[PDB]
């Protein structure tokens, strides 16, 4: 029942009785969808006008100053990007698209009101506007050769919000929020007086605003309190409040008051605030299209506030999802573009002031400098923008879906506590509550749920199924958060009689958004899926319901930190969410059209597509694999093809898995037999014990790639040389170094070995007389140059997979450098030309097959089109400035070195289970020592039972029993296939193994005998089982599976100690306990330091291990030392150890000498503090007191 090539190769058992009403929506849709609306217009969507085009149209007309010049926008043209994303990243250039717009200017006599501009400037031209960054189909941005992801931002929606502080009774408040600009506020008072403020200022009556414009007793109390006599007086008072100590002006105040709230550019609602305000007052008379504030709107807001004080109405909830909206990265890009456009418009108005030309074209006035800088500044320095995590494919999906309220317009980390961190009732359908940072940012990540979707207004919506006449309809609809509160929704778990009618009279459902017991008749909707509430990352964990929420959150955060192994192993127990996660992430290749593989090699895939069952196409497509691609986490990424020659394939099938993917399924862990008994105190707490077979079998070995860059710069004294000709260096050390001075590719480098050699000149050596005598005795000259070669840090071992060199610009290349560059270009073009010919040769063979079928004009230009791309590829390599980059002026040359070193799990490493149980390996034991079953198979890992009782992670025990059942099922299949390997009996054995339990009915009959033999070989290690997160198989089904395996109906089994061979009293549960390794190696954490460089300002040691590191001494540690009374330890550590320059040298000499002496005259930091005080008028000095 696999129905797919990936499914056909291995068949995974499935569980649960819930039908799949709707398939999961695309995970990356939210990131991809926002960019398209900004850069594209769809008639069906109704997005006729692109946002960028609308922004250009709004500010295009200027009419500077009666110059007979008119600026009109005609059209926008987008230039093709110079380099593809793969080429841009290798070069380090940022993927970008040129933006061009058409401006028409009309000129004429420019007389006083006659024929000013109707007879001139009939000529118009396209003017370059700037460079716009482009988004890949994966929705990621490459900047400076670095991939980046912009997190979505959640911000309070523009509108009118009424809230009352409880400090005083009747203290209601009215707030109006604009999309941009200042927002006015109204505050009630204990006396019942009304006050109006703008953002911040002196308190004043709200009546002043009405005076400027032109059962209620509140107006009477407020009117008498204010002494304002006329609107002019009120306007002068408002101007004085806005600026203090500034004289009022007759026309100055009028322009300022209208400008603050009556300027369209200055103040706009964005069409969201106006829509909310009209709905809140329910008035259609005010124009919805105009986003500017109106006198009627302000009077209505004041009326609503008075009505709330009367007691008719309800206060709004800020925490409510409907009030909060999510802002896409493209909207931020649009805002930056608008700011740049405003600056450009101001420049154009100023630019017209100087004219020195005849029939001047409208190209000189346009300036593109302002727009490019703002967008680049936002992308490079954007707080929301950050490097995407490369640890695993799941991590990349988690980061893109993440929405952060933090950033501009966002609450500060310490500002908001105990309010936004909680989960609202509306959060169930929009944001998964089990996933959040355990750090202070906890409760702000608000990771988006898998089924969560974004409406055009930016409000998240959740799919639901309507119910008619007590009968559930199959129609699926999306409900807004505000709409959802009124309706009552029943959970999908509720059973049906097959007529879509609820059997139970009383069911648990949310009518007010809070779970309650209600009759089936009142229910109006049903949940589309059980896992809809949980996030996509949460669904991966099996037996989620059995696990505690805190432990589940800890496990979910830990799984994303998992590090990929050399061989991917599919988990025996899986929710089945892994296959969707792998397909959605672009780490695997999917065939565009149905075709039969023509040639397969581990560098590219060639496929031929049949036109009869497919739309018209070239008939040949080529897919290029990526081998050992470097990652931000320094994790090797490579793609291996699962396709075979002459293998039928269909669109959407995975030709080959790429990163952390096995057979189209994401695997971050290896299955190991696990026992649950305390051993010798090796795991007293969270410690984990490893048999060592995994270390020997390379079960947990990972490959890390390290890039080292050496650059050459021109100093004032001289230009530094990377040539490997350094005095005082032996030939054997330089023997690995090539004649060019760059280490040979593929050559193992010991720690501290020279990767590149550089010499920098020195002057005014001023050698001391003893040094002079030494030079005279040996006739030794003093070098005027010093060597600063690049060497790998100690404790690091690797081989050089790739070497990159960039030459100088504007300088003719040397024969070795110039010849090397030409040779590299020819090899890339020559390999491409032969490779391009190979594709051309395959097309020619296909034509020969179709020679009877007419190819004379059918593919005449097909070869020509391929030739143009090859020429462009040759041009692109020579299209560079000659250094492959600008290089930054003052940089002579740069070199890039890539080293890949394998890593194997060792003691002190950290392993975290999917259930959230985590441990650090304490020791490695011999295979004989590890406990074994009566069969004698060893137990790879032993776990502590006490920890499971303390934390309710009951899911892990159930998974271990399920894993044991899967292990038992595999052994029976191995016994059946060990002898008499015939398809007919194997089919019966497979029917018993899969159809014995469950209603899945895999229908293995469809698979041919040849497929059956491969499937049996694949299942030898284990039989895959898929469990729904809330639809997991019950204990009875697992017990039946254990019986089929022939194991007793319990997890525990008899075991014998290896050392004495005597069985332990009491049986011990054995489970697969699938495990993953977190990215926390102990190799980089050792941080051993004895003597290190000191901070220049404080003469104190550097920290963090960046250079020599060292451990800072805490103030609390000083308190503990004072409690101990060890003054000698405290005094010595503070002076000689840290800032005593005289003491440190003396201490080092004494330690080398071995003689005992102590000098602690003073600490340098105290002297620096006295100097800082001395600069101020206050004077601090040491003194002697005889009094």
């Amino acid at each position: 029942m696999s129905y797919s090539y990936a499914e056909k190769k291995r068949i995974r058992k499935e569980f649960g009785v819930l039908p799949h009403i709707l398939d999961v929506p695309y995970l990356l849709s939210i990131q991809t969808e926002s960019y398209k609306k900004f850069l594209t217009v769809d008639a069906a969507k109704g997005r006729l006008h692109s946002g960028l085009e609308i922004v250009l149209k709004q500010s295009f007309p200027v009419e500077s100053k009666n110059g007979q010049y008119e600026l009109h926008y005609v059209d926008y043209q987008i230039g093709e990007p110079t380099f593809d994303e793969t080429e841009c990243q290798v070069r380090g250039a940022t993927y970008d698209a040129p933006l061009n717009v058409k401006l028409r200017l009309v000129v004429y006599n420019k007389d006083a009101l006659p024929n000013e501009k109707i007879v001139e400037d009939i000529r118009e031209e396209y003017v370059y506007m700037g460079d716009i960054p482009l988004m890949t189909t994966n929705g990621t941005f490459i900047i400076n050769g670095t991939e980046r992801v912009v997190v979505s931002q959640l911000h309070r929606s523009p509108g009118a919000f009424f809230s009352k502080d409880d400090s005083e009774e009747g203290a209601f408040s009215a707030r109006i929020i604009p999309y941009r600009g200042s927002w006015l506020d109204f505050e009630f008072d204990s006396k019942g007086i009304i006050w109006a403020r703008i953002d911040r200022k002196r308190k004043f009556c709200a009546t002043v605003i009405l005076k400027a414009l032109g059962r209620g007793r509140y107006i009477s109390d407020t009117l008498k309190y204010d002494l304002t006599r006329n609107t002019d007086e009120a306007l002068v008072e408002i101007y004085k409040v806005l600026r203090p100590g500034d004289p009022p002006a007759a026309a100055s105040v009028k322009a300022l008051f209208e400008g603050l709230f009556f300027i369209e550019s200055r103040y706009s609602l964005s069409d969201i605030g106006r829509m909310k305000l009209n709905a809140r007052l329910g008035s259609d008379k005010v124009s919805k299209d105009i986003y500017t504030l109106e006198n009627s709107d302000i009077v209505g807001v004041i009326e609503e506030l008075i009505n709330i004080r009367d007691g008719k109405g309800k206060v709004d909830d800020i925490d409510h999802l409907g009030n909060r909206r999510v802002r896409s990265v493209g909207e931020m890009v649009e805002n930056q573009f608008r700011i740049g456009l405003y600056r450009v418009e101001k420049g154009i108005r100023e630019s017209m002031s100087l004219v020195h030309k005849d029939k001047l074209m409208p190209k000189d006035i346009v300036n593109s400098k302002p727009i490019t800088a703002a967008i680049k500044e936002f992308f490079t320095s954007g707080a929301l923008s950050q490097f995407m995590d490369q640890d695993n494919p799941l991590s990349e999906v988690t980061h893109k879906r993440r929405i952060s309220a933090l950033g501009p317009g966002g609450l500060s980390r310490d500002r908001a506590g105990f309010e936004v961190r909680d989960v609202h009732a509306t959060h169930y359908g929009r944001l998964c509550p089990i996933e959040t940072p355990e750090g202070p940012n906890i409760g702000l990540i608000n990771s988006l749920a898998s089924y969560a979707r974004v409406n055009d207004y930016g409000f998240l919506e959740a799919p639901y199924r309507k119910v008619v006449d007590g009968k559930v309809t199959d129609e699926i609809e999306y409900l807004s958060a505000i709409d959802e509160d009124n309706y009552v929704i029943a959970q999908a778990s509720t059973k049906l009689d097959e007529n879509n009618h609820f059997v139970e009279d009383i069911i648990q459902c949310r009518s007010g958004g809070e779970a309650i017991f209600t009759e089936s008749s009142r229910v109006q909707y049903m949940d589309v899926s059980a896992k809809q509430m949980v996030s996509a990352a949460a669904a991966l964990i099996p037996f989620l319901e059995h696990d505690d929420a805190n432990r589940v959150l800890m496990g979910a955060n830990m799984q994303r930190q998992a590090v990929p192994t050399l061989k991917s192993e599919k988990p025996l127990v899986g929710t089945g969410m892994e296959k969707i996660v792998a397909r959605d992430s672009g780490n695997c290749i999917i065939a565009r059209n149905v075709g039969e593989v023509a040639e397969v090699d581990s560098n590219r895939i060639v496929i031929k597509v049949d036109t009869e069952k497919s739309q018209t196409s070239n008939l040949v497509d080529i897919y290029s694999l990526t081998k050992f691609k470097r990652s931000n986490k320094n994790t090797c990424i490579n793609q291996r093809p699962i396709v075979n020659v002459g293998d039928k394939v269909e669109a959407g099938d995975i030709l080959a898995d790429g990163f952390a993917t096995d057979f189209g399924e994401l695997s971050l862990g290896h299955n190991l037999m696990v026992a649950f008994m305390p051993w010798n105190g090796y795991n007293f707490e969270d410690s984990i014990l490893l048999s060592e077979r995994i270390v020997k079998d390379d079960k947990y070995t990972s490959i890390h790639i390290e890039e080292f860059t050496c650059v050459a710069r021109d100093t004032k004294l001289g230009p530094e040389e990377i040539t490997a000709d350094i005095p005082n260096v032996s030939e054997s050390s330089l023997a690995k170094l090539d004649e060019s001075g760059i280490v040979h590719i593929g050559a193992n480098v010991e720690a501290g070995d020279i990767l590149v050699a550089k010499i920098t000149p020195k002057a005014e050596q001023q050698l001391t007389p003893e040094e002079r005598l030494l030079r005279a005795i040996f006739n030794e000259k003093a070098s005027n140059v010093v060597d600063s070669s690049l060497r790998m840090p100690s404790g690091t071992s690797g081989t050089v997979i790739n070497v990159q060199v960039f030459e100088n610009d504007k300088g003719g290349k040397s024969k070795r450098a110039l010849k090397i560059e030409k040779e590299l270009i020819d090899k890339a073009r020559k390999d491409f030309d032969e490779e391009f010919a190979v594709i051309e040769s395959v097309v020619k063979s296909s034509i020969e097959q179709e020679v009877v079928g007419e190819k004379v004009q059918n593919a005449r230009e097909y070869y020509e089109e391929a030739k143009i791309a090859i020429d462009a590829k040759f041009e692109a390599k020579k299209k560079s400035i000659t250094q492959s980059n600008e290089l930054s002026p003052g940089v002579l040359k740069t070199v890039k070195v890539f080293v890949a070193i394998k890593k194997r799990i060792q003691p002190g490493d950290k392993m975290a289970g999917r259930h959230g149980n985590k441990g650090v390996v304490s020791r490695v034991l011999p295979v004989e020592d590890m406990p074994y079953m009566e069969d004698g198979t060893p137990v790879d890992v032993c776990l502590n039972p006490l920890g499971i009782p303390s934390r309710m992670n009951i899911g892990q025990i159930l998974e271990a029993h399920l894993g044991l059942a899967s292990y038992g099922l595999g052994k029976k299949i191995e016994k059946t296939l060990e002898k008499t390997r015939k398809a007919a009996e194997l089919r019966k054995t497979l029917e018993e193994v899969y159809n014995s339990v469950g209603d899945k009915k895999v229908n293995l009959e469809a698979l041919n005998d040849e497929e059956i033999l491969t499937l049996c070989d694949n299942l030898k290690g284990g039989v895959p089982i898929a469990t729904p997160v809330f639809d997991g198989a019950k204990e009875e089904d697992i017990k039946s599976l254990l019986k089929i395996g022939g194991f007793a109906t319990n997890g525990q089994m008899k075991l014998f100690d290896g050392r004495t061979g005597k069985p332990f009293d009491r049986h011990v549960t054995v489970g697969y306990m699938y495990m993953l390794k977190l990215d926390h190696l102990v190799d980089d954490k050792m941080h051993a330091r004895s003597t290190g460089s000191y901070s220049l300002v404080t003469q104190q040691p550097l920290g963090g291990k960046a250079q020599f590191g060292g451990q800072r001494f805490g103030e609390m540690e000083v308190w503990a030392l004072q409690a101990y009374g060890a003054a000698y330890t405290l005094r010595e550590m503070l002076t000689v150890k840290s800032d005593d320059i005289a003491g440190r040298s003396k201490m080092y000499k004494n330690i080398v000498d071995g003689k005992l002496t102590m000098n602690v005259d003073v600490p340098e930091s105290f002297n620096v503090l006295r100097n800082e005080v001395r600069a101020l008028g206050i004077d601090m000095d040491f003194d002697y007191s005889s009094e």
Binding site: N367, K810, E886, G890
Partner: protein, 48 residues
């Protein structure tokens, strides 16, 4: 030059029509194009 012909540098073209009458001067002239950075300036989080 960048707006009229798009190309950012064209340094040979830049020397083609200039009153500077020097090529070494432009190479040394643009070298001091960077203002000194502020030591206390933050690097975002950057390990804080």
């Amino acid at each position: 030059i960048l707006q009229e012909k798009g190309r950012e540098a064209t340094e040979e073209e830049i020397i083609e029509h200039t009153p500077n009458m020097s090529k070494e001067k432009l190479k040394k002239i643009l070298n001091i194009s960077h203002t000194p950075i502020s030591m206390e300036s933050p690097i975002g989080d950057d390990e804080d």
